[model samples]
Target chain A: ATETATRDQLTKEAFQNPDNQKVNIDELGNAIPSGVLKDDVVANIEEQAKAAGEEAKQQAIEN
Target chain B: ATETATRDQLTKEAFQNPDNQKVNIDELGNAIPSGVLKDDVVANIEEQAKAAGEEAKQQAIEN
Candidate 1:
């Protein structure tokens, strides 16, 4: 209950922050710092894509 | 010159927007709407990652 309560509180606080408006997809894309997140988001994407490709290959072999 | 001028104008407008502060990495991540951009950013990350991997593979083959 405590953990749930804290999570709820955090979400509430995030919503109330003035800058935390409900932005559209384009707006969110524009807001991102181009160079900074390229490494992180790109890395995460690469890992997932590699996993997916491997899984597909295995699935094909199994079939 | 026109393209550069327009880009500069847009940048100026974006900066003047109250919400367009130079936020920390954490804040930008939190401010994004979870479900909407999960698809876009993740997809973009995936595409770039794949391209990078392909390029690396090509370079490795060349060398």
Candidate 2:
């Protein structure tokens, strides 16, 4: 119960922090600096997000 | 017409490129690489997206 509570609390806080809004997929994904990821990879992320948003919307509606 | 056509195609291409899908919102929202944005703050635009996604998800479900 304690671990469950902690996990739930973390999830709730994470969800509330607005992780989705602040993120500019284009800017983040397009450039992504040069330590771990590449430009094309980031760009790939941007493209995926757009397509996924549509798919996710449909699924969310259905479910 | 050509300009509009180009714009439309670009939009389509941009959306199709997988930027959004590939982007790791958590990675972006968390670390942020630290230039214009900070770890804790990311202007209003970033938070707006997370909030908007929740609101939009709600709306999509509703409609």
Candidate 3:
């Protein structure tokens, strides 16, 4: 008999991977952790971009 | 006078931004453009990583 994959296995293989940090945006403008609004994703991305920008700036300064 | 933001405005200011390329992963394993699977995102990211690796390799060769 074939074994079915568990949610833990799927999450570990997919969701929790560092290289793939994105979660799909839902039709109701919510993320998987429901009630997390579309605005939340934008905010998170903005934060990520800001961090990237700062890292680049610091590296430029050091170099 | 106050202007209410439209969906287009929201999409333009947030979704269409290059810095925010991620759409949240839904509970059903679907992405924003529904039916695009989690596996699809993983495949896409893998492709992107591969392309970046190739670009780096080319740059290394050039240098």
Candidate 4:
């Protein structure tokens, strides 16, 4: 079964640290980086995080 | 200027993996949990991830 990522995993992956696994940030959270993960996977993670990061910035306004 | 978190740090922090530091996800990326960090810091991280996760989840539906 696909696993859910904890808060730490979610943040790191979204930041594209290249050490993150395909852990689900909430199903919306399955995304990337390096080390053991594949190259394309990292790219996908970069893109996903890029998109999410954009909105995540918006989310940061109040918090 | 503040230090930005690597992708790995970001994911782990958001997921509350308890190993993340105070690395910023971006200018909007400061948030966290776990060892080395303060207790309130983790709580703040949880809330930030929670809000970001909601929108991030929405972002996932399309990407």
Candidate 5:
């Protein structure tokens, strides 16, 4: 399995590797330890996705 | 294949596009048309591992 993947980002940093450090995930590609923002970050993502219904709407529109 | 990048975020909008517009992800970066807070959205990646394990177990039991 490959650990590295490219991502499109709203902002340039949106796709940057958080912490700017190389992480070694498990065989299943899971990071054992994470930074403080991990939880809040994910939470924030959900919030953004919820708030930015446009993205999801766009998905439906595209389909 | 190079874009701008930065660090430091405390809000759901931190990484948002300054314009708050629709984003096009291409040029080797993938976004997967996801609204499920893709990738790091899993606060505890281990939970996902366990959940996946349980799913596999259920599948085995069914089989």
Candidate 6:
């Protein structure tokens, strides 16, 4: 199984082996932690976007 | 052979089709736009984090 790493850790993972660095999204769409289907940094900005949206809103309001 | 889309456009591309939805990272790690290697949403949070970091700095200064 691979660890779900955020993009912050992705840069370090660049050019690294995919053995434990990635996972394969199966044909059925289940996350199988052994292959090259793990999104490299997809979760990176997605998680940030959600959190940033909330923070941005508050900043706009307070500022 | 594909457009570099940001995370904002990724949500729309979800479960759509990998035909034009993804890319393969080559052995040398070149981003080849014709496979399932296109990071599903890796760019999503990475981009946001960078942009948010800047905006947060400004907000902190003023607030």
Chain A TM-score per candidate? 0.39, 0.36, 0.38, 0.35, 0.33, 0.33
lDDT by residue (B1-63, candidate 5, tens digit) is 111111112212323322222223335553222122233433333345455566656776774
Candidate 5 per-residue lDDT over residues A1-63, each given as its tens digit: 010111112222333444421223346644422222344544555556454565545565774
lDDT of 4 by residue, A1-63 (tens): 001232334344444543334333444555523225445554565555555555444533332
User: What docking class should model 6 receive?
Assistant: incorrect
lDDT tens digits by residue: candidate 3, B1-63: 011112112223332232333444546754442212345444554555566666656676774
Worst 10 residues of 6 chain A by lDDT: A1-10
Alpha-carbon runs more than 4 Å astray in model 3: A1-37, A55-63, B1-36
DockQ of each: 0.03, 0.04, 0.04, 0.04, 0.03, 0.06
Tens-place lDDT per residue, model 6, B1-63, is: 012223323333332333323544657644433323335354553455556566656666784
> Over 4 Å off in model 4, which ranges?
A1-48, A54-63, B1-35
Worst 10-residue lDDT window for candidate 3 chain A reads A1-10
Cα lDDT tens digits, model 2, A1-63, are 123223322322332223222233244454331222234544454555565566656666884
- Model 6, position A20: C-alpha lDDT score: 27
Question: In model 1, how large is the Cα lDDT of residue B18?
Answer: 31
Q: Of the pair 1 and 6, which is ahead by TM-score?
A: 6
Which candidate leads in DockQ?
A: 6
For candidate 1, the per-residue lDDT at A33 reads: 22
CAPRI docking class of candidate 2: incorrect
Better-scoring candidate (lDDT), 1 or 6 = 6
Query: Candidate 6 deviates by what RMSD?
Result: 12.7
Candidate 1 vs 3: which has more lDDT: 1
Candidate 1 regions with alpha-carbon error over 4 angstroms: A1-36, B1-63
Better of 4 and 5 by DockQ: 4
True contacts kept of 4: 0.00
Greater lDDT among 2 and 6 belongs to 6
Q: What is the TM-score of chain B in candidate 2?
A: 0.31
**Residue B29 lDDT in model 6?**
45
Per-residue lDDT of model 1, residues B10-63, tens digit only = 332332333433333354454332211233433444455466666656676774
Ten consecutive residues with minimal summed lDDT in candidate 2 chain A? A12-21
Give the clash count for each candidate.
Answer: 0, 25, 5, 30, 0, 11
